[PDB]
């Protein structure tokens, strides 16, 4: 039978991205289902092995998937991961693209913490979006995991904590829908951008769509300009109209961080915790789904 690593049976393709395809797999040793990421060896962009190193650097952190095997086999670089549950985009669609405020706030608290953990390990993620957060399986079904480190990079030296240098004139990295304003402006990403993107993710969950989503264009050149033009022309107070002020406060705080500033993650969690209590919610892990 077809097995990567002599050990993982290849199953159906369950996802695609710029940095490889993802397949279901089965560990023949245990019958454990896994996720198998494949990257063609003849790729412009040797990346998967770097992503695997970052996963190894983050192992043991709460909400970080476990890497089971990496290696080269045939025409592919292979990374085998623990299989997680549905993504938040999956669950959003499952819930008919409506999440309650309670579910949004339960998710926000964990997502801020996942991003903080990555930053604590000296990396920025650079591709924060609903598809890249997955719920755990079974017992860990209440835990939000973060995936996809294919665009991640160090923002500071591990020993000296010297921050990487500021630059402009950069081409867009990440996804147009959730990228920070500064990314659209060509500015080097830093910690603040991961958190701004999360702010757009949270308003997406509240609204069902973002105002710069689904714009008519033709070229990809012109489409990203359309998005960058809309995102900038929509004030945060307009974006967040009809929702608690904490969401605007969150976004304004992220936009006000300087390039090398350390975010106050505890402040941002407490904005939403305070709202959670005001609403009378209990942190009982009853999500909408």
């Amino acid at each position: 039978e077809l097995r990567v690593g002599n050990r993982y049976r290849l199953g159906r393709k369950i996802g695609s991205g710029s940095f490889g395809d993802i397949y279901l797999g089965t560990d023949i040793a245990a019958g454990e289902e896994v996720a198998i990421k494949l990257e063609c060896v003849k790729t412009k962009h040797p990346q998967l092995h770097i992503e695997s190193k970052i996963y190894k650097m983050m192992q043991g952190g709460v909400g970080i998937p476990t890497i089971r095997w990496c290696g080269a086999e045939g025409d592919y670089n292979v990374m085998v991961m623990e299989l997680l549950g549905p993504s938040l985009e999956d669950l959003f669609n499952f819930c008919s693209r409506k999440f309650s405020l309670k579910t949004v706030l339960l998710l926000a608290d964990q997502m801020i913490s996942r991003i903080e953990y990555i930053h604590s390990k000296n990396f920025i993620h650079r591709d924060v979006k609903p598809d890249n957060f997955l719920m755990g399986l079974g017992k860990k079904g209440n835990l939000v995991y973060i995936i996809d480190f294919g665009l991640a990079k160090k923002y500071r030296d591990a020993r000296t904590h010297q921050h990487i240098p500021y630059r402009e004139n950069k081409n867009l990295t990440g996804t147009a829908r959730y990228a920070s304003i500064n990314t659209h402006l060509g500015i080097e990403q830093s910690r603040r951008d991961d958190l701004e993107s999360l702010g757009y993710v949270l308003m997406y969950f509240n609204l069902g769509s973002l105002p710069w989503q689904g714009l008519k264009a033709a070229t990809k050149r012109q489409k990203y300009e359309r998005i960058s033009e809309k995102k900038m022309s929509t004030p945060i107070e307009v974006l967040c109209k009809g929702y608690p002020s904490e969401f605007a406060t969150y976004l304004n705080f992220c936009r006000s961080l300087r390039f090398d500033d350390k975010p106050d993650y505890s402040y941002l969690r407490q904005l939403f915790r305070n709202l959670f209590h005001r609403q009378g919610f209990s942190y009982d892990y009853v999500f909408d789904w």
């Binding site: 991205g17 867009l172 990295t173 147009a176 489409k223």
Partner: peptide, 7 residues
């Protein structure tokens, strides 16, 4: 608009 882009 949802494609992962590289620098």
């Amino acid at each position: 608009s949802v494609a992962s882009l590289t620098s």
